[PDB]
Amino acid sequence: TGYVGLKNQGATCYMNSLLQTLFFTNQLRKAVYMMPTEGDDSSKSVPLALQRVFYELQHSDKPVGTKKLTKSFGWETLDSFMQHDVQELCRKLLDNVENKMKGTCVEGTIPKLFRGKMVSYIQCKEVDYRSDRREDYYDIQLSIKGKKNIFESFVDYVAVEQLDGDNKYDAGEHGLQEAEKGVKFLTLPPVLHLQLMRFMYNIKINDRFEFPEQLPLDEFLQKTDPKDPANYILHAVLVHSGDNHGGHYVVYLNPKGDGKWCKFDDDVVSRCTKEEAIEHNYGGHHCTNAYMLVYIRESKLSEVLQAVTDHDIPQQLVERLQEEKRIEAQ
């Protein structure tokens, strides 16, 4: 296959799945390597622990462990990961990583890859007041309940919500008012993280839900751009088999963005057909389905998946991890 797996070391649920996803964000991996960890304490550094995992994932022949990583950010108890979702983990990690990249030469690699722009508006009906506020996002939570496919989830996400009755909007000087509230997309990031809301208040929905290999998003933008349309390529499918309580977690990746998919199941990585990565995870009348999707903007595919080399890893990092290996071999 060419790639190595991560160890099963407890009920870390989505973690290993997310680590492979980030690791094959080749642009992001190179930045993580540059972070100034030389003076950090392993027992407490999240940025170092993630350098270790990625370095190990790029060079190790054998399943890579994560215990220094779970120790770093303090999710160490039996049910620590059962009490959070991927989206919390992903934001905990990347935000820990970006705070370390600040004041450094790779400041802002995270928002470049992951952050998009939204507008949320409240528009009064019988009165002429409007409030437009721009929001940044690093991922999108899409509702799946009673939607056939990702297009309908996007339809529902930008659908207007009405404010009336006991719910009227406080228009300030204008008093209480009937108004419309919704969101539009200003920008979509090069790397698009879509969580699929199968897990809700505390149960798992296993209904069929379709997503494509190629995801055209132009029609949900406020203003579009030729020479850079919002065409998106499916890079990762994070899969859960079972019901809410207990399950197996796996990730399907075509790491080069070339349509050649592998399955990453903790320590076993095999090639699989496209149909197994995609349609076989739609769910429906069993319990094996996607709860998170990673799309890469087609125009930025080549760059986001730029090849990484042993040269892209700083020598002083290489040195620190090696002495760590040697001390352990005793």
Residue 206 C-beta-side C-alpha neighbours within 13 Å: 12
User: For the chain, percent helix, then strand, then coil, each to nearest 5?
Assistant: 35, 30, 40
One-letter amino acid of 287: C
Instruction: List CB contacts of 15: < 8 A, sequence separation 6 or more.
Output: 66, 70, 81, 89
Q: Which residues pair with 135 in a beta bridge?
A: 118
Beta-strand pair 140-142/191-196 = parallel
Spatial separation of the C-alpha atoms in residues 170 and 265, rounded to whole Å:
51
Greatest C-alpha distance within the chain: 76
Residue 298 has which token pair? Answer: 């087609």
| The 3-state secondary structure of 215-266, one letter per residue | EECHHHECCCCCCCCCEEEEEEEEEEEECCCCEEEEEEECCCCCCCCEEEEC
Are 194 and 200 in contact, with CB atoms under 8 Å apart?
Answer: no
Establish whether 285 is a catalytic residue. Answer: no
Query: Among this protein's residues, is 248 annotated catalytic?
Result: yes
Residues 6 or more apart from 56 whose CB is under 8 A from it?
A: 4, 64, 65
Neighbours of 7 (CB within 10 A): 15
* Catalytic, out of 13, 90, 124, 262: 13
Q: Which residues of 103-131 are buried (b: 16+ CB within 10 A; e: fewer)?
A: eeebeebbebbbbbebeeebbbeeeeeee
Q: Of 269, 235, 239, 241, which is closest to residue 255 (Cα–Cα)?
A: 235
Question: Which residue of the set 59, 105, 248, 287 is catalytic?
Answer: 248
* 268-271 and 262-265 beta bridge pairing: antiparallel
Domains annotated for the chain, with CATH where assigned, are 5-115+299-330 (no CATH), 116-137+158-188 (2.20.210.10), 138-157+189-298 (no CATH)
Give the resolution in Å. 2.2
d(CA 168, CA 174): 12
Contacts of 183 (CB under 8 A, 6+ apart): 118, 119, 120, 121, 135, 157, 158
